[PDB]
Each structure stands twice: as structure tokens, then as C-alpha cells.
């Protein structure tokens, strides 16, 4: 089924299809010039694919407030919906990440719902950092890492329980983000806390299917604000090689220090075979889960330059999960998301486009100024045509929100759900 | 009335006294050939208060959960309840802040359930980073700075609203925080955000009353995540000095971008008569909250040394107001309080033993080694005895949280109050 | 002429007709979208950046130096590079100085200026090391240093400063100094503020009618601790309190880390005292990186605040635009000629948004399609603009390749005789 | 004796009374919390921390360096007065050496060493920067460079700095490189680190039985993009590739803003690759400040996860401690005096930390009592504690007030001709 009205696709993608013709036609031949064929560019971008976060199609909120929108979703199945105007519209989205228990319900049931949709899933997401009704210990203290046997036992049996579900839906990976950690200097012991965490996390392991994959992820602090158990990819690769070939690391752009170097965080991980996936959003001051590419676009499309040099240094098995993990405060979440799968295929796209030959002879020659500019020639290039035409030819939109926004969508589902 | 058994605190007291005698005495030695009198300080220390949020008693949050304890408040009443037990352990917190409208209710019942528990208002706080029931016009794009008229008029009546319930129960300021900024390059402009900002806080500012102050409070971020309105001391002080007298800046310690040097601000603010007050805590990334000098105690030390420099050099029309803004999420909100304003008390002490005429010396002749020495010198003394026996001769109780465990209060409370239930914080 | 004409044209001549093709594709979007690329054009052959005299060297770090060939022997040296940059670029007629490395005859200064058609910046005075000498050291400190007899050599080398700009065609004063504290305690921050202001007070006091006098804050470095010019804040209380002939410089890579700069620029703006901009990139401190290279979004978003001002009709409002960056691994002069080839992209770019469209977005709160105007704008290619400005002014469409092409780092490297002590 | 035994003795008894009565009160407090103060004494005369030659040489910044008076220059130099440092403290038996910086005859360098009472740690190599008549640059790189014969050239650097320190008693080799790049694209980050791992390899080869390898991460400085060895992560993988005999050297201004260093540590100690410590303080970068002037808690917080390794001996845990300091505005012997102080300070606090009450409140999740219970420690002042231990073992009682007392700068001044009078 569809969503969106197809007519209204039709009519939307007439009304812009001569500019796209002729803006396609340029860039077109502006590669051609530079070597670069644009239909082998179009046809992979066609093919990147990331998924879509159920809890980021829900208008999202800090500690101080939450100010929900129009026709907020009322549960998975109403998320999964939202999801479906998202792929529709992108057709960069056909999966959808869930997260138990906030999207617990009959396994049977989603997969019926993504199947008719059109939706697949991906990663499941366990959530052992917050409480849920009738639960014997609380995670206040921490879940994997905590101190009490018994609480640990019950992270592990939550974990084992969202494979099961995922099993049922289709699903072939297991993220594991837990806030275990501590406020105070001295409240837990550094060492110990990790070792109680590998030792519950190898549990996990023996539980998971010989045909998933288990994904640890690091993060700085939030909720901890003095230590995290999984603070940084260091401590992750240490859990991903200790735990074995089917445990990897997760990088989230918004869960390190300022100023780090993600880019070679995700290059060295790659070196060592345990890039498992991304989480991806923007961010300024912390874990801020903005739009993909709103605040540094450059970022963005550096990541996609060593996921794309993986491939060119012959690089091989390298299957990367990705995903939109964000918080959407301030906007309408399908538009935010919408914009944001965009934003990724354009970093991708655009590291599609750097002249690796030409960037290997300038970082044999330590010509900084040329290897550098290189990049750029890539990175200025406007491949919104390259989007919008990979879009188009698959049953997408030319313009996503303005279609979206055409169709009076949120009006709909406004009316549709309660306020 | 006393929240917590008098036979409680002299028995916990008694246990303790002849260590802290001893204690006392040999600090006191140590002070003597330091040329320092252990007596003075104690007399300072014992005049030293810090005010307590009224929310800050009961167990916080993030936006990805929150671990509510027993016993948890239900309203302001039981809040001041709790403050109470702070004040009567720790005698350095008398005062409370209120936050509008979440302890909103009859400003006489509150000022008699003050006077009765032996605790006055400091600092009104105004709202308007969130919705309330039967809300006209939402937050969620602004308040003060809204580009709506009606929404910013909302806004300042409620602010106003802040100052009729503070006079009425004692309260002589209105501290004004609000999340107001964008989350996206475009989405605000940010000059005319802050004129929208400015005019309204003017009107805010016509309803003070003579003897009243008005503090604007900056923050960096959080809930704004890519530019707020009042992001820092530069924008505060254009703030204070456009509105007037009256009007003066807010130093939250965890409000600053990483690596700053805040004790540089404080000093600042002074130079310039803008330092209206602080909001103490601690931290280590971000806005943590964290109970205050458990992460950089020196930090703490060093913004006390600013203060006392100022309150040493008869800097005239100096009362800053100061007040512990923490969040609880993994302690018992009363224990973290106590120790809090404990440390506060602590880096205060240790200001007042620096040798401020040695310090200048070394200051004049550039002798950056000595002067630091100098001030090390003051830090590293443990001035705990002192703080002890202050306690101890305001009727408060030498271990506080060693008294508060021993008289049972949280089972107590826990007793009295519906249960709470562990959730969410926001993030959906 | 530093760059052979023949040599201009024939690179010019072998890239025309992709220029042409770029240009003209570029030209027929951006009139689809209610833009005239003439008018961008236009404002872009007119826009100016400020290249430092010192930046023309290669630079170091307390760690090492590694010199290239040719590197400039003095100041004269170094302006005939500053001509290769505006020759290839033609964004960059004036140089600016700083004092005492650049210490001549100001009337040979102006001379050789005018030869190699170069006017002169802002000048920049130097309290932050020591010459040879000088009856004070400045290692405690210059302008804020506790010893008065200190505190008076560094105004007077300030006013010395002055008197060579007014020579040389100067109208403006950049001060940035290096005083502050290592250690907590080691300074009394209100004391050491004051004498600045006092010092600073003198310094204004000699300035020219039609001068500017801008100060310059920066976080840390060379002080670990304590700055006294440390940030905007106390930058802007020097400038209200100094008069309307001071300003704030803000320079991209001197604040903290996470720091929302384009709404400092903003604020300065606002209350009349954003002087000028040091441009440069950085990921970690004061790197002082070719501008745009790490963070090409930030430099548009700066200029989006400049242009913003524009747009609201701010008087009087024309900010001095200078370039301060350290080449530590690259020929100083293809980073300078690309840094401001960046600097005017982020200001073509900033040209481009629909601003009628973003006010409607921003009044009705329309974060997703606001921050999508600036996205339409920044995702824009404009270096066919940039391209054609320099082909239309006498520049090179390519720079960087017409500088390789001409051959002039190896003439310089066989004309100049590398230091050996 | 570099400072005069009566004069010792002189300023130890003008404050043995007050030291009397402070150690004596301090016993009789720690007595009452269960504690033997002769028990921490005893480890605390025993604590050693390695002082760099080049530490007590003036440092600077890119921008200036302010020699003070009586500069040590040459090894010789450097060595006598490290040996002050040595005879005052009694925390600093050892000295690190940087070549080519200290490049003298072995076996000169051994007799001066043991007629001092001086002995000698961890070598430093130096492929940051280029000596004069060297064949390669190190300009983009040294053991990562793209140039084969650039990285045999630094290979052989190395093993030369091996056979300089098996000749003195060095029993470790520390390889700190500046290596990075300055913009994205300059260096493929893979590459660069197979690079590094391969010459890294061929170091490893040349050490003996009883040597170790230290690998130095830092996240930037030289490099202002990238950095082949950025943080402890790569660190660990460097250390884990090449084998039993190489570890990591953690250095505390060498990570990024609020990184918490203390995990970073017992991470290492867990893996049994805590090669060392590079000691120092900072507020904003790599600003190699005084040991414990800044964030003296944090210091402490370290040493309490060593202390809890030192307690129980780990496996692999025998961690080298060297202090990395940087002097721009004080004394550098009085400057690396009171570092030396400060470390055997958090040493001593962290000591005095009840073990068994901490380990019963993380089990029961005591939050509070378990940072209360470090606190106790911390704010307990052990200055008289670390006087005794000086005083029992030939040093001072106050360090700095008999280093001063003795005119021991003046003296080297005299004796040593500045650049200018
Ligand atoms: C939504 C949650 O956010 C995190 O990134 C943690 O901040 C994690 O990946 C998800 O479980
Ligand atoms: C509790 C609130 O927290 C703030 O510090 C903002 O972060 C403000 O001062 C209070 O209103
Ligand atoms: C080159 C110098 O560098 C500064 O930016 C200070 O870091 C200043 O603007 C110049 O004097
Ligand atoms: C003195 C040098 O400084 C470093 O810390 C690098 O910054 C290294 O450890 C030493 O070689
Ligand atoms: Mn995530
Ligand atoms: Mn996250
Ligand atoms: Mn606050
Ligand atoms: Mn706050
Ligand atoms: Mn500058
Ligand atoms: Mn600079
Ligand atoms: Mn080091
Ligand atoms: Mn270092």
C-alpha cells in the first residue's frame, strides 16, 4: 500500500521534472569531463540504504521538556506507518530499527505490518537503561555491569529476549548501548565494573545466532557523568576482540569527546575488522542527535571517505550496518528523518566522486595541498540531482518534503490520532 | 519544630567529640604558627549560607530515565520538609529557592511552613522552558524571545507572576533561565532573537520592587542545541547592563564550554558589578549537575578565592547570592545536599586562609611559583574541624550524613509518602 | 610582474571552455532560482582579504620548523610573494604587516607597494617577544605587566606601529598580546585588566581621526592558565570602554572548544563592534590551518552573520577582512592563494540565500526549511564565480596550477640564499 | 654536593619544630582512622619519578622562549642541576635523556651520572624534528612516512638511542613522533599506521631481553588534523601487535577535553600495558604546566588506580613514571621540585585511601560513602608526611625555601653567559 497518494508523487515530481532534467544533464556532463560517468554513480546511490530509528518517528525531548507535535504516533505500529512515507517518498530507507521494550508487541504482528509496508528490519536495540513495569531489579545502579548477580542475570535475559523477537521479524543483529557507569569518583571500581560487563556481554554472545552479529557501543557519558563501563572505542575494541568474530563496534558520531578525529576512529576500527555499524546524526555541543549533516557536513562526508577507501584498498567483508539515530525536538520527525537518509547518500555520493587515483599519488608525494583539494573537488560537488534522479526512478520523490508536505500528511494523521 | 531528634544529633555528637576536640585543637595549632586564628575563621564559616533548590530534594533525571528513591516529595510542602532536615544538620542552608509553577501554591501557607521549619526564600524561578496544563501558548519554540507577541507577553506575565509570589513570602530576586535558542544553522536569527529577548526582560524589569534583583543566568546549551540565546557571560553582561541596576548576572558552574576559565568570569562580573549570584555543582562534560567539588574540588577553591579577594578588599555593595542547582539521580537527594553545601563551606574556609598580603607580594614581583604556592598552601590545609565544630555550636551535627542515616528520616518519609515508579526521561 | 602574463594566459586559455560550460550551467540554475549570477559575480570580483606578511614564510611549532626553498629573507621578500597572490587571485591587493619583523623605511615599504600594486592592512604590533635591546622583558607580560617602566615600552612600541601605518597608507591597529597567567594566583585577574585598560587607553589616545584600534581575544596560548584578553566578552568591555574607535577582532580559532562563533560575530555586530576577522581553520586549538579546510560550514555560517547585517541595513558597517594562518606543511603562497579562494566561496555562497524565503521561516518557526535555505545556498558549486572573477580581473582561473606552471617557488629558491644560523 | 650541606642543615632545623608538631598530629589522626603513618613514610621516601634533562632548560611557546638566568646548556649543565633536584627531594634519582639533544660520550655521560648520585631512565628519541646534515626531512612524517629510506633513517635513530642507553643503564626506549597530517586527504589513516607498525617492528628487534618499548599516544601537536598515534586506543593496538615487551606511555595533557584519564589507566592496567606515565598538569592543551597546579584531584584519582594495582601487584603493572613538564615563567628546578612534591603528594593520599570501606560501597552501591571515602584521603594534607620522608633521607625539609636560601641560581648564573647581559 502507499501512504502517500500516488498522484500527488506524480504531480509533485511533474511539476519539478524539467529543472531535474536539465540539472541532471549539467552535472552530467560536468563529470563526463572529469571522468566520471554519472548513471555509475546514480546506480550505487540508488543502492544505499540506511535504516530509520522507530523512536526518532516520535517528536523527541530533553530532561527540562518534551513538546509533542500533531499526530504523534501512538505505538510501534502507528511508528512503523510514519516509517513507510519515509521509504516511500527517500527510497533510501526500507528498514526500520526497533527498541524493546518501547516497541514490544506481537512479533508475528510487525513483521505482517513491515512486509505490507514495504519495510524490512534491521538491528534490534535492547534497553537495559531505564526500568520497565513489574521489573524485578532496577537499573538505577547499572544492568550488565551492576554489582548484583541477579540484576546482571536479568540484562542478559532481556538481551536473549530481543533476539527472539528479532528472530521472528527478520532481523540479524543485536546493539547493545547500556548508561552503566558512574557520577562520583570511587562509587564504582574501574576494572571490576568491565569485568562484570565481558563477563555478561559473553552470555549475550553464546545466545546469538551463528547468523547474527552483536554490536557494542560507546559513549563518552550520558546518563553516567563521571565514568562510562564502554566509554570510547578503545574500551570497545577490547569487548568486541574478547567477545569474538561475530561482536563489533558501533560508532555513534555524537558519543565522543569534542574534538575528536571520527573519521580515523572508523578507519582504524576497519583496519582491525570490527567496524560493525553507525549511528548517525549531527551534533555541536554533545550527544545533541540533530539531522545528519545540519551542523557539519564535511564530517559526514570524511566518514563516507574512509568507508569508500575500504573498497578501493581492496578491502574485503566490509558490510557496514547504518543507521539514523536521532532525536528530533524541534520539527516534524518524518521531515527531519527524511532530509537526514538524504544527507547521508549526498556524503556518500560525494565520496564516491573523489579521484582515489589521483589522491593516492598526492599522498605518496606528501603534496598535502593537492590531497587535500582533491577531497574537496568531491565534496563541492552539488549531487542533489544525482539524489533527486535516484529518487525519481525509484518511486520516490524529486523533492521529498515538498511532496510530503503536499500531500497534508501530518494533517491526516492528526486527525487520525489522539492529541 | 525538628525533622530530625534532638537526642539523635547530641548522642551522634557526643560519639564524635572528643576526635573533633582533638582535631580541632591540633588545626587550630597548625593555624596558630600560620599566624592565623583558628576562631576568626570558625566565625566566618558559621555566617557562610548557601541556598537549596526546593526540587533538588527529590531524585533526578535524564532524558533517558529516571530512578525515583522512597520516600520522594510530593509537592513543595514536603520538599521544605526535607530542606529543613539540610538546614538543621548542616545550619548552612536557611534558605530556599522556589521554582514556579512547580511548588506553586498559598504564598502564606508556604511562609508559615517556612517560619515553622525555620527556613526563609531566596531566589524566585520562573518556568518558561516548559508547558504547563492549560497553557495558551507553548514554549516549544521559545518564550522571552518567541517570535510570537502573544507568546512572549505569556511569558513575561508569568515572570511577573514569579515576583508577587517571592514578595510575598520573603523571596528579594527572580532568577530567569529559559532554553530559548535553535537546534538548526537558519532557524533563529540571532541578532533579532535577542532584541525580542531584551525588550521583554525590560518589562520583567519594571515590575521589580525597589529592594529586588533580577538575574539572568547564560547557558551554553541544553535544551537548545546549536545556538541559545543567553550562551555566555558576554551576552549575560550586555543583558545586565542594558536593563539596569537592578539587573545582574548568574554564574551556573556548569554552564560554561569546555576548558573555560570561570573564576576569570567571576572576577569580571565584579570589576564590573554584574555578579548577581551562583549556582553551584559540579561536572565533568556537560551541564552534569553533579554534587559540588566531587569532581574539582580546586576549581571550586579558586572561585571562592575571586570572592573572598572581593569581600577582603571592602568591595562595597558585594552580597552575592548563592545556591547549590544540583540533580540527584544515584544518591538520596538530602545526603548529596548536606555534603554539597558542606563543600561549598569547605572552599570558603580554605579562602579565608590565604595569606592575601603574601599573595600580592608574589603578585607584584611576578613570583608565579610562590603565588601559587601561596594559595595551595590555603587549599591543602583540611579544614574539616572547622566545619565540624561550627556545626556543632549552631546546633547542627558534626557528621551529617552520619546523623541523618542514624535517625532513620528516609525510612521515615518513605513511610508517609505514596510509592514512585521508575520510567522514561524525555527522550521519547 | 611576478607571474609571467603568457604563462596566465595559456593556463586561462586550456581551462575556458570547461569554465564556460560550469559558468553558464551554474548561471541558468541560480536564474531558475531567482538569481542573477551577474550580480554575485560582481559583488565576488569586489570582495578583499587581507594576506599576513608573516604567513608567506613557512611557519612552525614549538616542536619544529621545516623550511621549503625559497623562503623569504625580510620583508621585501615577502611582499614580492604577496604579489604572486593578488596577481593569480586578485582577492588579496593588500598585505599586512607586523612590527618588528617587518621594520623598514616606511617610505620603501610604500614604494615597493605601489610598484607591485599592494596597498597595506591593518598593522600589528608585537609585545608577545622580545627584541634586541629592549630595556624590559615582556616575559611576565606587556601592556597588563605589573612594572610600569614595562607596561610604557610596550605603548610606546604600539604608537611606533601606529606611525609606520600612517606612512605607509595603514588605518587600523590590531593588538594581540600573549599576557596571562600560567599558574592560579600568579596574576590578580582585576588588576591585570585594569593596567591593560590604562595601557590601552594611552595607545587610543594616539590613533589618527579615521583609525581603528582593535583588540584581539584569544582563549590560551602562550599563557596555560589565565588570559587577560581571554575571550568576547572582555574583549567587548575594552572596546565600549575605550571608545568608538575601538573594535573587537575575532579571530576563528581562539575560542573554546564547541564555541558557537558566528554568534559572537552576531552580538559584536549588534552592539557596533566587530572590528575585523582573522581567518584561518582549526580542529583542535589555535592551528591556524588554510580557512575552510577542516570546516567549510562554519566560514559559511560566519559569513552568513556578515551578510545578514547587510541585509538588516547595519550603518557603517565594514569590517576589516585579514587572513592569519601558519603554513606548516605546504608552499605558504598555493595555501594563502587557496584559503582565499575558500573565504570568498563561504561569501558567494552566503550571497545566494533566499533571505525573503528564510524570514518567512524563521518567524513562523520552520527549523526544517529554514536550515534548508542556508543548505541551498552552502550546497551551491560556485567556484565557476570565482573562476570567472579572476579570468574578468586579470587573475587565473586555476591559481594553484598557474603558480606550478609558472615555475616561480624554484626561481625564488635559486635567488634566495636559505639561513644557516 | 651541588647545594652546600650546611645550608641543609640550616633551613631543615629552622623548621624541624613546626614539622615535629605537624607530623606528630598527623600521626595521631591517621592513628585514629586505623592508619600507620610510618607504614606510608616508608613507601613514600621510596616513590621515584624520573625529572627530564631538557626539563630544567627555560621552555617556550611557538611564539617566544624568556630564558631566565644561569641557563643549562649542554648535558653537562643539564645534568648538574637535576642533580640539585635530586639532593633537595630525594624523589628524582633518575634522568631521562633526548637525543640528539643530550648526544655526548656514554661513558662521560655514565660518570657524571654516578658522581652526582644520578642515574639514568627510559631514552627519548627524536624524529619530531631535523638535526642538521641529516639525509631525509622529517617534515611529513618519520616512521610513518611515505619514503622508505625516511623511515630506515628513523629506524635507525631508534636503535642508536638503544645503544646510547644500554651503555648508561637505560633499560626502556619512549618513541613519541609528531607524525599526522594537517588536512583531511594528506595521509590515508590506514596506510600511515601499517607504516608506523612495520618500523615499529624493527625497533622492537633491536631490544634486549630486559628492555621495553614505550609507544607515546597524543591527540594532536605537531599535527593539527590527524595524528598516526592519536589516542589509547591505537596505542594499545600498537602495543598489543608488537609484543610482551612493549607498552603504552600515557601522558596526561595528551588527551582530548574531559577525557577521563583515570579509566584510560586502569584500562591498561587490566591489559597489562601501562608502560608509564608522563607527568604534568593542564587547563586547555598540551600545556605541560606543573603537576597537580591545575586539577590536583585529578592526580590523585590517578594514583588511586595505581595504588590499587600497587596494592595487589598486577601482572605486567611496574609502571616507569616520568615528569614531561614545560618551565616558561618560573624556575625550572624550583618548578620541577614542587612537581616532584605533588606526585609523591597524590601518592601518599592515595595510600592513606581505605580499601576495604571503598570496596564495600561500590559493592552496595553507596555512591556517596564511596566518593566520601576517597575524599577522606584527599583532603587529608600529607605535606608533613612527604617533609619527613625528605628529611630522614638527606633532603629538605622545604625544597624550594633551601634551594633559595642557598643562592644556587645565582651561583650558575655566574658561571654560565646568558645570550645578552
Ligand atoms: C536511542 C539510544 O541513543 C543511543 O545513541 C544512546 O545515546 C543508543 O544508540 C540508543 O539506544
Ligand atoms: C534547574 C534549572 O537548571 C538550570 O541550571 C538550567 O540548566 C536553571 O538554573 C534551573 O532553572
Ligand atoms: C600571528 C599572531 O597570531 C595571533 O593570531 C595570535 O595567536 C595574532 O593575531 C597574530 O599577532
Ligand atoms: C618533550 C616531548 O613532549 C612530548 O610529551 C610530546 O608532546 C614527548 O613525550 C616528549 O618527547
Ligand atoms: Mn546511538
Ligand atoms: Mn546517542
Ligand atoms: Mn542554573
Ligand atoms: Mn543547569
Ligand atoms: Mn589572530
Ligand atoms: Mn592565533
Ligand atoms: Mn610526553
Ligand atoms: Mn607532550
Same mark, same amino acid.
Given at each position: ?45 540508488? /543502492? ?12 523527541? +525531548? ?8 500533531? +499526530?504523534?504516533?501512538? &505505538? ?19 528498514? !526500520? ?22 519495510? &524490512? ?12 513495569? =513489574?521489573? $524485578? ?32 521479524? &527478520? ?5 547493545? %548501548? ?5 557520577? @562520583? ?26 547468523? %547474527?552479529?552483536?554490536?557494542?557501543? *560507546? ?13 570510547? %572505542? =578503545? ?18 558520531? +555524537?558519543? *565522543? ?20 555499524? @553507525? *549511528?548517525?546524526?549531527?551534533? /555541536?555541543? +554533545? ?15 570524511? !566518514? ?11 578491502? /574485503? ?10 532525536? *528530533?525536538? !524541534? ?25 582515489? $587515483? ?17 577531497? /574537496?573537488? $568531491? ?16 518511486? =520516490?520523490? !524529486? ?8 500531500? =497534508?500528511?501530518? $494533517? ?8
Amino acid at each position: 500500500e502507499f501512504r502517500i497518494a500516488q498522484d500527488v508523487v506524480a504531480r509533485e515530481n511533474d511539476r519539478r521534472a524539467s529543472a531535474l532534467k536539465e540539472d541532471y544533464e549539467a552535472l552530467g556532463a560536468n563529470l563526463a569531463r572529469r571522468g566520471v560517468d554519472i548513471e555509475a554513480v546514480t546506480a550505487k546511490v540508488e /543502492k544505499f540504504f540506511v535504516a530509520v530509528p522507530s523512536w526518532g518517528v516520535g517528536t523527541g +525531548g530533553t530532561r527540562f521538556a518534551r513538546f509533542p507535535g500533531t +499526530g504523534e504516533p501512538r &505505538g510501534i505500529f502507528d511508528k512503523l506507518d510514519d516509517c513507510a512515507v519515509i521509504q516511500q517518498l527517500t527510497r533510501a530507507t526500507p528498514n !526500520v530499527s526497533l527498541h524493546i521494550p518501547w516497541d514490544k508487541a506481537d512479533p508475528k504482528e510487525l513483521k505482517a505490518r513491515g512486509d505490507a509496508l514495504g519495510l &524490512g528490519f534491521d538491528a534490534m536495540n535492547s534497553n537495559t537503561f531505564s526500568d520497565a513495569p =513489574g521489573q $524485578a531489579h532496577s537499573y538505577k545502579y547499572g544492568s550488565l555491569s551492576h554489582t548484583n548477580a541477579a540484576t546482571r542475570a536479568q540484562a542478559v535475559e532481556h538481551n536473549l529476549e530481543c533476539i527472539e523477537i528479532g528472530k521472528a521479524i &527478520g532481523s540479524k543483529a543485536l546493539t547493545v %548501548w547500556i548508561g552503566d557507569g558512574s557520577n @562520583f569518583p570511587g562509587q564504582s571500581n574501574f576494572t571490576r565494573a568491565f569485568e562484570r560487563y565481558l563477563s555478561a556481554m559473553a552470555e549475550i554472545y553464546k545466545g546469538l545466532p551463528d547468523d %547474527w552479529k552483536l554490536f557494542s557501543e *560507546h559513549k563518552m557519558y550520558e546518563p553516567a557523568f563521571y565514568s562510562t563501563v564502554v566509554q570510547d %572505542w =578503545g574500551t570497545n575494541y577490547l569487548i568486541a576482540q574478547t567477545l569474538g568474530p561475530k561482536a563489533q563496534c558501533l560508532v555513534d558520531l +555524537g558519543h *565522543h569527546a569534542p574534538n575528536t578525529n571520527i573519521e580515523m576512529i572508523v578507519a582504524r576500527l576497519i583496519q582491525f575488522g570490527k567496524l560493525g555499524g @553507525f *549511528h548517525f546524526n549531527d551534533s /555541536k555541543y +554533545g550527544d545533541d542527535d540533530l539531522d545528519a549533516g545540519a551542523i557539519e557536513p564535511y564530517r559526514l562526508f570524511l !566518514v563516507f571517505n574512509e568507508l569508500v577507501d575500504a573498497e578501493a584498498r581492496g578491502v /574485503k567483508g566490509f558490510h557496514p550496518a547504518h543507521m539514523i539515530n536521532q532525536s *528530533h525536538n !524541534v520539527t516534524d520527525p518524518i521531515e527531519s528523518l527524511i532530509n537526514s537518509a538524504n544527507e547521508i547518500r549526498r556524503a556518500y555520493a560525494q565520496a564516491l566522486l573523489v579521484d582515489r $587515483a589521483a589522491l593516492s599519488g598526492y599522498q605518496e608525494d606528501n603534496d598535502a595541498l593537492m590531497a587535500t583539494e582533491t577531497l /574537496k573537488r $568531491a565534496y563541492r560537488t552539488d549531487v542533489e540531482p544525482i539524489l533527486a534522479e535516484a529518487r525519481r526512478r525509484t518511486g =520516490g520523490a !524529486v523533492d521529498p518534503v515538498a511532496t510530503y508536505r503536499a500531500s =497534508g500528511y501530518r $494533517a491526516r494523521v492528526a486527525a487520525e490520532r489522539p492529541a
